[PDB]
């Protein structure tokens, strides 16, 4: 439970810092201080309107690629098996498959910011 003890201590020590930084250093709020910041002026009124991406295409490819790397994390242990021959081909095959998918997306536009 040693990891639990340091985890508990860490989140505790963080909580004291926010605790005495909210009660000790005075309190005075009169609305316009409490208002959002828009570089000096009053916002158009939102911060909740759809802030549509312009790079949505690459986001999903990250999920496919961040997923597939989890398939090759076992590589250090995969090297120390009695069958490195098929290990070499299969592990290589994954890297070309990611390479092909990146190459496929690259050629058909893709990574460049969708406009």
């Amino acid at each position: 439970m040693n990891i639990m003890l340091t985890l508990l201590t860490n989140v505790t020590l963080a909580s004291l810092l926010v605790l005495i930084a909210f009660w000790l250093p005075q309190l005075n709020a009169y609305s316009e201080k409490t208002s959002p910041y828009e570089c000096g002026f009053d916002p158009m009124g939102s911060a909740r309107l759809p802030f549509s991406m312009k790079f949505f295409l690459v986001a999903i490819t990250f999920l496919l690629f961040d997923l597939e790397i989890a398939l090759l994390l076992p590589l250090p242990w995969a090297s120390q098996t009695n069958n490195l021959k098929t290990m070499l081909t299969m592990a290589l095959f994954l890297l070309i498959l990611l390479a092909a998918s990146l190459a496929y997306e690259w050629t058909q536009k893709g990574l460049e910011w969708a406009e």
Binding site: E38, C39, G40, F41, P43, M44, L49, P50, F51
Partner: peptide, 11 residues
């Protein structure tokens, strides 16, 4: 289309 308005400046 609902492009949000950003108030650059004067600060």
């Amino acid at each position: 289309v609902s492009n949000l308005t950003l108030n650059f400046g004067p600060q």
